Design a protein around this ligand. Structure first.
Ligand SMILES: [Ca+2]
Lengths: 49, 57
């Protein structure tokens, strides 16, 4: 048959999105992982990069 | 911004008062009680303000 049994299309949406899950910690710049503020400068790469 | 402490100074304060201000903030999973206080110097205004004088002078 064929690969790709799924299609995704772009949309325009007025609907609001609440995806902004809060991060009290440090939001990693590239990865956006929410690391605890205590893990900065501990010598471990707890974020990415 | 936060509201000022706007409360009027009351007659029960007149010798002196102490303002303490505090909040608990519970960031991450751990609470910290945060607080400050200042000494308030209030006028020695009497509540009844009794005054005495002789009628002739
Ligand atoms: Ca680290």
């Amino acid at each position: 048959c064929n690969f790709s049994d799924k299609e995704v299309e772009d949309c325009v949406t007025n609907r609001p999105c609440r995806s902004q899950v809060r991060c009290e910690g440090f939001v990693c710049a590239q990865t956006g992982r929410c690391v605890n503020r205590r893990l900065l400068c501990n010598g471990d790469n707890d974020c990415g990069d | 911004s936060y509201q000022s402490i706007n409360i009027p100074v009351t007659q029960n304060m007149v010798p002196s008062s102490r303002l303490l201000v505090y909040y608990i903030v519970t960031g991450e999973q751990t609470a910290e009680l945060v607080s400050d206080s200042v000494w308030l110097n209030i006028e020695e205004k009497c509540g009844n303000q009794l005054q005495v004088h002789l009628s002739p002078d």
